[PDB]
Write a structure and sequence with these properties.
Region (Interaction with RAD51) (chains A, B): 734-775
Strand order of the largest sheet of chain A: 3-4-2-5-6-1-7
Structural class of chain A: alpha/beta
Domain Helicase ATP-binding (chains A, B): 35-210
Oligomer: homodimer
Strand content of chain A: 5-15%
Region (Helicase activity) (chains A, B): 35-464
CATH architecture of the largest domain in chain A: 3-Layer(aba) Sandwich
GO molecular function, one term (chains A, B): ATP hydrolysis activity
Protein name (chains A, B): DNA polymerase theta
Shape of chain A: globular
DNA sequence: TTTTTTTTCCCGGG
DNA sequence: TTTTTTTTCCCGGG
């Protein structure tokens, strides 16, 4: 019955699942598994709370289908970290029978090909490209199941409409243009008010349940009253020690065994509340017991001290007690340790802005939401229900809590957020029909014409009848026109064929809207190209961010004047000019009408490209944030996104027909991949030896600094003298004084100390002193 | 004794040599072979007339040394064609025992490496690079013999001083810096007046002989008197039919069996005298017999008719009789047939400017030199003795003749040219000692410092004592300075080390003087580079010719105005400007003082680069000479020299340290190699199908035009539609009308007929008509 | 005044 | 108002 053994599973699979400690299944799982003909063929849509085991049925169905019919499967997931964890889980579970679970998430590309794989775990945007390729090459029939998580994002999002672009396409191509269920689709949502309409569109069943192992109480508190539930008093809060009374609330939670989670509305605000709690804990417990261990807490200090960026000041006066912060201004490795400590004991109190609301699974006891207004706007209903989902620890306590501290002035705002479920899911396509067509519809029809699925306008009119007309119920004729004067398709006397620009957009998969910006940058490049410095090629591969940081305009104008002579020639060629910056940095704003749109996009990518230049040329990170307004967590994200963008413009140029430019872009992929050196780490222990001098000195020495570095002085000086490019140091018959000086200040030893010969004696003398201390 | 069998030779070698029909050897060969200790070790220098067998001793010595001691050998030869003939001779002779005779001449690079070879046949400039590489890599000891032909060119020439740069270097490095003869050197000259001084410098023997199988008489004729020899009358010339009386002189030669050779002082002049003789032959022999065959003469007409350039008008009215011309304004294949006919019968009379004076071996009977003044200057003594050397046919007649037609006004000019032997050989280095150092000395010391043979100035002072001080008998100190401010070597506190620019010059081996021009062109390129068209990359690989044609300045200014918008941007970047051409083309000349030297070199390479652009883009050769003042023989030479130059700038950039530019230059080596298509020849039989459309149409059709071309019209139109690069056809927010139009006139079908769709119907209709005629 | 995520791929014998 | 000559190199299994 409910026992896992009485369900027909492989022996190794059941043993592995019992190793985790799961034996029974809830009645709702069985009810939804035996709901109609979901088990054999057909599609399924259901919505269950996240606290209850939700992936049981999905894994059972995918295992059944894979073991019965040999066909590939997809496991589209929202984020990367959850995708990696799910990939590890699936591999460790199917590590015996043999599936070769492999993930496409992030830059972790598969070592093998898609054909050898059986189950692929991908993100939202890395499955659309896979399906597009499976359409371009006639191998679509390999697909046998598509599993989608978090279905309600298909309505409206920055990247959630890809589900609505993908599902209709696969269903139409597999069934409507071909004629049991050839492709099975299952989905998960969160208590949608119109879940029936989604199931009918996909021709599926419908199961809705509401069962949680822990019955949490959303005990909203206002002032001293704990008026909650249906506006009824349950308890009265007394003023404990104070200097809102937030500190008193965490005290009773801290006492017995429990923990607190504070959701700040700002990063800094997390820091402010973290130090405040730390003061009270030490105030009257070191001069009731605080109940914390000290053997492992001091060990954690060691890990936080060995990071290259070093420990943080606010992370030293609060970590000794169970207080810290987990905002986004931390290194991915540094922020991982804070999460690890909360996983089992040690730290007790925590703070966060939004990171632990979606992306990680860290349950705890009663959760404080603090103010009910975030960023000057009312809190979203979906966000509030997401935070309170993590207000219960499974298998330890019996009940959960969720106390929202709302000021007496507002009052009704908490009640409105307390009373409400969700909103109906829109289409994003609907918006306008006779007005300007949305960017989602333009990408919809262009992405099948390039694949050749639909050629005649009559055929494509059928396609639009399977995505939105049956969903919740001219535009096509106006959408075809937009693709015409923009040179995306070509028309004969009525058959449409892809052009070279249309094929380039699909292969690289940027967008049918931002491709018009990258194309204008590459076309302007083939009229003059600076080849001495590496800034003009760093401007064509810089990632395009809508808003990644508050671009300071006073500092940008300051760095504009101090640029060298050679690097100022790239600026005039790419488009950035001083006149625009004169109007800006003077309490200005954006504008419209085409021409002003190009000006803002040109200047925004230059500031990002300037930052990326310094990371290639060292410029230690402590001084990076001093000159450029940035953050430690933002710098790391830029490095990851720069490598992916460099290798994607290369595909754009290859399909476009331009072959000479492609070689230049492909050659630069090596330098942008920073990585971490391991063998060179021993050689990098020298003061005046950067990463660029390791390779040249490794050819001869390839040893430590004690005896290898103490081998003559002429050989060492000459070896590093010939590594630099030529860079002649005499004025030509057409150059200027500034041009030659920039060619003379580059050969100086760096940073930028003495002359060439003087550094040879300094390096040898410094090495001898270091050798004596070591020995 | 004199028999070849009694000399100790391999049986196969002697049988092969007897196959050619050579049995005995003259007494001078034995005398020079048994002269001192030349046979075992030591060096040899001798001078013999070219008519007598001169290579017997050289081949005997090289065979002896190779068969005795396993060591490589070199056979430096002046020209390429003679080098190829010598390579074929040596291979066919040593085709049995096993030597692997292989030549470096021209672009015919070896398939294997130098180590596997045993005997290498190289030109003058392709052995200096080999020796430089054998110095750079410590493998000099493989050399065991160096054979030099035409030694007297070492004195003064445009490229003859390389022998004086090479011999001293090898001798010094092998003997003076190391301590029997480790390396044996043999040489051939032509009756030098100071041959003793050359032998003592190389520490060799000396043999001088004067013996010719045919005793030619230099019967100079002036007016009607044949006053010759020591100014003595031998015969009186009577006036035969006339309209100088040049035609009458050839008549008696033509009659019995003999032939005539006329050395014109100009190309055209050869044409003028060729038609004149043809008129007289037909005048009174078709209305004594002319004595010529007609079966093979008509066959020769067929070969001259199938050339791509077609037959020549002046080559049709004189070829029916034994008259033609052999100037340099002919294709290498076309001019080969004329030489082949003269090899055995058929054609009897011939004309030439200088081609048959040095480079080919075509002996004949009495030779007429015509005027004794060439190009407004007195005839060179060496040139006159070179022409009369071919005034005797071996094995047919008994005596030769050489009649120089000198007008009665000059008279003494012929006597001075008749009485005289040669002039003493200079050094080219001597010229000036305290004055500006010659370009030969700068290259001399730079070429050993880079190799590291000499480091201290004391050591190098010894080097100059082995090349010229002992030859025919401050400069070194002034020569080192010139290499200093020009950044060719670097100096320490006295030891000199090569720089990056110095190593680049030796590897590519242009010159220590013209490298300063190529470097200034590449440095100017890394400040802006046009990547759309292929003219900016065609300007950096254009061969640098001192004077290859009379550059017309009126037409150059005309083509300057008609250039498109994109191609005029390259002109401003490279240096060519309208202002300079305004002063020129107005009865102007050259100038001096550095700045004017760069201006002339910039503009001269642009005219050559414009010509090379059309050859890549078809532009049939008949119209090539109409717009550009050129010649059929000059166009072919430009194509051969362009391919070699493209692959040599690549080596220059690799050693210089600039890696991004090297990739662009290396990618262009493929297009510059025109070649001849063989498989595509069948596909090229279509009117509207050039070489670029063969590859795209070969993917689908790959057949003839009868049935393969008659396969639908949409498929054919689309296939050639997508081959062109994108080349968008809409004006951008920053472009101009002219820029867009140049992007719209390129997609038109070419040439440059109807629109894109119209050509599809025209091609199909034209193919059907051609198919009907064939079938 | 916070939270994310695209691309194709070379090395060994010669 | 004619006659010449430099350079290093990739393709197959995956």
């Amino acid at each position: 019955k409910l026992l896992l053994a009485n369900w027909g599973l492989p022996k190794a699979v059941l043993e592995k699942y019992h190793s985790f400690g799961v034996k029974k299944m809830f009645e709702w799982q069985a009810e939804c598994l035996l709901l109609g003909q979901v088990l054999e063929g057909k599609n399924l849509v259901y919505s269950a709370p996240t606290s209850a085991g939700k992936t049981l049925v999905a894994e059972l169905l995918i295992l059944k289908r894979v073991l019965e019919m040999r066909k590939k499967a997809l496991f589209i997931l929202p984020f990367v970290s959850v995708a990696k964890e799910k990939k590890y889980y699936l591999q460790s579970l199917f590590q015996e029978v043999g599936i070769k679970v492999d993930g496409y998430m992030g830059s972790t590309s598969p070592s093998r090909h898609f054909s050898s794989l059986d189950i692929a775990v991908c993100t939202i945007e890395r499955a659309n490209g896979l399906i597009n390729r499976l359409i371009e090459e006639n191998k679509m029939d390999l697909l046998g199941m598509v599993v989608v998580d978090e279905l309600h994002m298909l309505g409206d999002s920055h990247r959630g409409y890809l589900l609505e672009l993908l599902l209709t396409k696969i269903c139409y191509i597999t069934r409507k243009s071909a004629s049991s269920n050839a492709v099975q689709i299952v989905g998960m949502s969160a208590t949608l008010p119109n879940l029936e309409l989604v199931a009918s569109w996909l021709n599926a069943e419908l199961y809705h349940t509401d069962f949680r192992p822990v019955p949490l109480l959303e005990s909203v508190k206002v002032g001293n009253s704990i008026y909650d539930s249906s506006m009824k008093l349950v308890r009265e809060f007394e003023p404990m020690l104070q200097v809102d009374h937030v500190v008193s609330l965490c005290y009773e939670t801290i006492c017995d065994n429990h923990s607190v989670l504070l959701f700040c509305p700002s990063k800094k605000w997390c820091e402010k509340l973290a130090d405040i709690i730390a003061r009270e804990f030490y105030n009257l417990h070191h001069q009731p017991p605080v109940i914390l261990e000290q053997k492992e807490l001091l060990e954690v200090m060691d890990q936080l001290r060995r990071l290259p960026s070093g420990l943080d000041s606010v992370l030293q006066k609060t970590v000794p007690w169970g207080v810290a912060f987990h905002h986004a201004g931390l290194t991915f490795e540094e922020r991982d340790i804070i999460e690890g400590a909360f996983r089992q004991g040690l730290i007790r109190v925590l703070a966060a802005t939004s990171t632990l609301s979606s992306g990680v699974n860290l349950p705890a006891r009663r959760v404080i939401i603090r103010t009910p207004i975030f960023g000057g706007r009312p809190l979203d209903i979906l966000t509030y229900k997401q935070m309170v989902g993590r207000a219960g620890r499974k298998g330890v306590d019996t009940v959960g809590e969720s106390i929202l501290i709302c000021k007496n002035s507002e009052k009704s705002k908490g009640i409105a957020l307390l009373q409400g479920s969700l909103k109906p899911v829109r289409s994003c396509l609907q918006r306008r029909e006779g007005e300007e067509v949305t960017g989602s519809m333009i990408r919809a029809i262009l992405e099948i014409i390039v694949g050749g699925v639909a050629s005649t306008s009559q055929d494509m009119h059928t396609y639009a009848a399977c995505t939105f007309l049956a969903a919740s119920m001219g535009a096509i004729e106006a959408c075809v026109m937009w693709l015409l004067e923009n040179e995306f398709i070509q028309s004969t006397e009525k058959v449409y064929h892809p052009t070279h620009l249309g094929s380039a957009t699909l292969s690289s998969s940027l967008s049918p809207a931002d491709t018009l910006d990258i194309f204008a940058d590459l076309q302007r490049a083939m009229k003059g190209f600076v080849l001495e410095n590496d800034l003009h090629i760093l401007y064509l591969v810089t990632p395009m961010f809508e808003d990644w940081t508050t671009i300071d305009w006073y500092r940008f104008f300051c760095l504009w004047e101090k640029l060298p002579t050679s690097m100022k020639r790239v600026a005039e060629l790419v488009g950035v000019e001083e006149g625009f910056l004169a109007r800006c940095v003077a309490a200005a704003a954006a504008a419209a009408a085409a021409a002003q749109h190009r000006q803002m996009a040109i200047h925004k990518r230059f500031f990002t490209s300037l930052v990326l230049l310094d990371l290639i040329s060292e410029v230690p990170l402590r001084e990076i944030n001093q000159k450029y307004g940035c953050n430690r967590g933002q710098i790391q994200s830029l490095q990851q996104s720069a490598a992916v963008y460099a290798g994607m413009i290369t595909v754009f140029s290859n399909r476009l027909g331009w072959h000479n430019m492609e070689l230049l872009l492909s050659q630069f992929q090596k330098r942008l991949t920073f990585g971490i050196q391991r063998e060179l780490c021993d050689l990098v222990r020298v003061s005046l030896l950067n990463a660029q001098r390791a390779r040249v000195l490794y050819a001869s020495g390839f040893h430590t600094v004690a005896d290898l570095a103490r081998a003559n002085i002429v050989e060492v000086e000459v070896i590093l003298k010939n590594a630099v490019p030529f860079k002649s140091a005499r004025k030509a018959v057409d150059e200027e004084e500034e041009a030659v000086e920039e060619r003379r200040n580059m050969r100086t030893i760096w940073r930028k100390g003495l002359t060439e010969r003087e550094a040879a004696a300094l390096i040898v003398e410094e090495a001898r002193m270091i050798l004596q201390q070591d020995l």
